[PDB]
């Protein structure tokens, strides 16, 4: 059956917390996070990937650089493009720039991606437990989220359908000794390690898809 708790950071699949700064590129950090976990599973090497490569080059797939985008479009770009560069070879500058993708600097590839059935938290749990970190969209436009600090995040104003931020679910768990109470999703954000809990947030889990965590989740196929 599925584990009671999962935390892929303890297994080497997750890079340190990054910062998107003033660019609306959360979608790009969510996509690189999921790709960093799948590459690690395939090769045993953790290599930080280029969000800038995605910001500058994926407009043909429908992304809008610093104005917005979507993780599934980023994985499509990776598929159609044949690769994705490392962060060290294509650094992040938080502004839309000229596409400078270099195939010789590619350290990741995908063949498309798999989507988790919309709105199904149990299906999201199955994906997290069997695959690795999963890219998800959520409604993050709340001052309570901006000022989040500890504990399980639960916000009555959250929507499960109007989403505006891409994040990465790296695990799940519960508080206490009963595995079925006070559950939460372990989510990595892209607002720097100074935001939230060392850059992470526990979002209420199994509470009717809180903030839309399971509404649009997906992962790359490597």
């Amino acid at each position: 059956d599925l584990p009671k708790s999962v935390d892929w950071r303890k297994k080497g699949y997750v890079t340190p917390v990054k910062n998107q700064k003033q660019c609306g590129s959360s979608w790009a950090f969510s996509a690189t996070g999921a790709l960093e976990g799948q590459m690690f599973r395939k090769t045993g090497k953790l290599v930080s990937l280029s969000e800038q490569n995605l910001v500058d080059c994926s407009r043909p797939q429908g992304n809008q650089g610093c104005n917005g985008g979507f993780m599934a479009r980023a994985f499509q770009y990776v598929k159609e493009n044949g690769g994705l560069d490392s962060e060290e070879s294509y650094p992040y500058v938080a502004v839309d720039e000229i596409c400078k993708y270099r195939p010789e600097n590619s350290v990741a590839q995908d063949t498309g991606f798999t989507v988790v059935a919309p709105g199904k938290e149990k299906a999201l749990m199955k994906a997290v437990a069997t695959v690795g970190p999963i890219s998800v969209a959520m409604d993050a436009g709340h001052s309570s989220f901006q000022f989040y600090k500890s504990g399980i995040y639960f916000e009555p104003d959250c929507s499960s359908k109007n989403l505006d931020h891409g994040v990465l679910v790296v695990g799940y768990g519960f508080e206490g000794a009963n595995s079925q109470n006070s559950k939460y999703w372990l989510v990595k954000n892209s607002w720097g390690p100074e935001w939230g809990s060392n850059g992470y947030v526990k979002i209420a889990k199994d509470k009717n898809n809180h903030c839309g965590i399971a509404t649009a989740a997906s992962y790359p196929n490597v």
Binding site: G24, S25, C66, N67, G69, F70, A72, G166, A216
Partner: peptide, 6 residues
């Protein structure tokens, strides 16, 4: 589908 971030 796109997340309007800015």
């Amino acid at each position: 589908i796109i997340l309007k971030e800015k």
